[PDB]
Amino acid sequence: QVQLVQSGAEVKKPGSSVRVSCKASGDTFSSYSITWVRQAPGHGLQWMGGIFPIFGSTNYAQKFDDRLTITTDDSSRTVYMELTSLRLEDTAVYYCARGASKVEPAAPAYSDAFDMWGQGTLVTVSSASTKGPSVFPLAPSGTAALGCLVKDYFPEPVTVSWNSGALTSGVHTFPAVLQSSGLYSLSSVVTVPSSSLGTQTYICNVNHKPSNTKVDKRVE
Amino acid sequence: DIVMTQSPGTLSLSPGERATLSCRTSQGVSSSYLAWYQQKPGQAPRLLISGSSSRATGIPDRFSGSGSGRDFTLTISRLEPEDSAVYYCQQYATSPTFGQGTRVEIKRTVAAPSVFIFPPSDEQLKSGTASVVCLLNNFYPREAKVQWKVDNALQSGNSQESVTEQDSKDSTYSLSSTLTLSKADYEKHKVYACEVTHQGLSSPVTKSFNRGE
């Protein structure tokens, strides 16, 4: 699995500056180009810039020519994006991605297809401050339903699993909604048959990263 | 700059039917400089096609690319269920530009939901808030209606819902409507119902509870 692994998502007050990391495989770091594409509601996939580590060369999009800077750390083959003087609009998922072409003698096509992508880093550009959720049993009364209400956090996101991975079939982790209070609220469920509530015990595994919260809550 | 325009916005076709997606450029681009991507819910995009029509590795034969000039197309020659997703075209002739995606929605026969209403956990009540949850499980189509009522008094403005994406296996949706009240109000009332209205239901279904057990 020749992969790309990224830093965690963050909340950032406007006018500040975030940096997102992109750690590669060595192969990728020698012979390919790594790009930063961001995606947000209302204008979708937006190219920002790209770096050729083997050359240390860069080419950013006009949209960011002063606020954005991309840097490598050869010691551990990590690429760094830094977007400066954050605006509200910057809020997005920022991906790093391998360009499809391998490097050529004469070069460098920064414009390229994107082969491999990382897993995503969600940058909330918000004046609100971090908050860890409060998880609450969703309790049942021949198939039953149960879950966990991951209520009241910030920013996005939280992840939810069941029995640290052992339960996955029938699991519905819903998309977070943003409340009038200004905090997020989420809901995971799983359906199981009634016979198993004598047999099996069910815990959800809630994890909200930017507050460093982790909870494991059993359900009746 | 070149402006990728994809059309239509959504495509709703059954498995085994052919999908064709249009991506138009604001000016002429060679076939060599085009990529297609697939994004399934909550993931990065996968490269499906580069240079107009070269399949990336591991990509099934049922995806093909074509076109040239200012009109490019991806055809999913015969849809799988698992091809429920959004799909993006990209010019990389100049400064990379992407379209705004096409969503393919996999058609299916009608499936009434199975409905489940959850009262508020004691640990939350000891905290002063009261969140009641109502689940609509595995229905199709996406059009459904959740009306909270408290002692036959119809609620409004206090409930939020969110909907899981189209399953890649059984192609249904699932929803989660949440009536929210103060611990105060939650005790002044007794019959907490949740009434569901969907195409698969002969007439609206009601689950409910009482504050008992």
Numbering used by the authors:
A (entry chain H): 1 to 52, 52A, 53 to 82, 82A, 82B, 82C, 83 to 100, 100A, ...
B (entry chain L): 1 to 27, 27A, 28 to 212
Show passages lifted from the paper.
To further investigate the antibody epitope, we determined the crystal structure of H3v-47 Fab in complex with H3N2 A/Minnesota/11/2010 (Minn2010/H3v) HA, at 3.57 Å resolution. Initial phases were obtained by molecular replacement using high-resolution structures that we also determined for H3v-47 Fab at 2.57 Å resolution and Minn2010/H3v HA-LSTc at 2.90 Å resolution (instead of the apo HA form at 3.15 Å, see below). Structural studies revealed that H3v-47 recognizes a unique epitope spanning the RBS and vestigial esterase region that is conserved in recent H3 viruses. Consistent with the ELISA data, H3v-47 IgG exhibited high affinity to HA from seasonal H3 strains that occurred between 1989 and 2011 (Kd < 1 pM) whereas H3v-47 Fab displayed moderate-high affinity of binding to HA from H3 strains that circulated after 1989 (Kd from 224 nM to <1 pM). While the F(ab′)2 form of H3v-47 neutralized at a similar potency to the IgG, H3v-47 Fab displayed a greater than 190-fold reduction in the IC50 value in comparison to IgG (<1 pM). Thus, H3v-47 requires the bivalency of IgG to potently neutralize the virus.
